[PDB]
Amino acid sequence: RGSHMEDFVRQCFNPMIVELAEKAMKEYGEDPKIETNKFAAICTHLEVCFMYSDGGSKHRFEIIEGRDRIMAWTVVNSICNTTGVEKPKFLPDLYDYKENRFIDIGVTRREVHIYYLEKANKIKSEKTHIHIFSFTGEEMATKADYTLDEESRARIKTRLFTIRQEMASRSLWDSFRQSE
Ligand SMILES: COc1cc2c(cc1OC)CC(NC(=O)c1nc([C@@H]3CCCN3C(=O)CSc3ccccc3Cl)[nH]c(=O)c1O)C2
Ligand SMILES: [Mn+2]
Ligand SMILES: [Mn+2]
Numbered sequence: 001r002g003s004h005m006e007d008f009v010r011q012c013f014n015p016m017i018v019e020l021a022e023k024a025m026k027e028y029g030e031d032p033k034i035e036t037n038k039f040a041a042i043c044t045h046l047e048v049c050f051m052y053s054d055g056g057s058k059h060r061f062e063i064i065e066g067r068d069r070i071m072a073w074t075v076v077n078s079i080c081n082t083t084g085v086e087k088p089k090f091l092p093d094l095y096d097y098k099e100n101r102f103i104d105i106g107v108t109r110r111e112v113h114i115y116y117l118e119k120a121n122k123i124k125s126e127k128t129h130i131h132i133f134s135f136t137g138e139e140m141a142t143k144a145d146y147t148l149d150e151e152s153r154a155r156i157k158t159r160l161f162t163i164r165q166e167m168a169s170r171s172l173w174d175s176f177r178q179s180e
Helices: 004-012 017-029 036-054 069-083 112-123 152-170 174-177
Strands: 061-063 092-096 101-108 129-134 140-141
Touching: 004 036, 004 152, 017 036, 017 101, 036 092, 036 101, 036 174, 061 152, 061 174, 069 092, 069 112, 101 112, 112 129, 152 174
Parallel strands: 101 129
Antiparallel strands: 061 092, 092 101, 129 140
């Protein structure tokens, strides 16, 4: 029962990101062929995380998203037992070696305020930095500290709005926005 959303996801994101998203969905018992809006959202989240790691210096960020559950937690404990940062209760997306903190990146179709509120109470980790991006071009980070310079963030927001235009041109945006 191949959907229009599935074929769009594959010719919109690069094969390596599609591969990682398929593995992440299948690991937690989900099928990219059926729950296709979630397939698109994980690909989007993965690409943003990768563009985000690109923004800093060469060795600024340790990428934890995109790893399997076991190795991702292995890297977290290595970072904790080396830098003394508190071990987060839930998996973050990156570690900032410059600012010495874990980052969880959020990509939402709702208002940045609402999504941020939920990620704060859910993570419950006082130390984990939070950075939210929306498909409309707004962002919101912990303590108003946006980590990267403006140009690296603007590149992410441009890509996010391009993705939304591409789904809107194929009439899949409405079903995607109504899926979150
Ligand atoms: C399936 O259960 C869990 C899975 C995972 C975690 C925890 C889970 O519960 C025990 C940690 C990790 N989640 C994130 O890294 C993360 N998750 C989100 C959103 C809102 C919070 C839950 N969520 C999901 O997507 C869950 S489903 C899912 C997740 C990844 C791949 C495939 C699927 Cl199907 N938003 C982010 O910005 C973000 O970084 C993977
Ligand atoms: Mn994550
Ligand atoms: Mn995240």
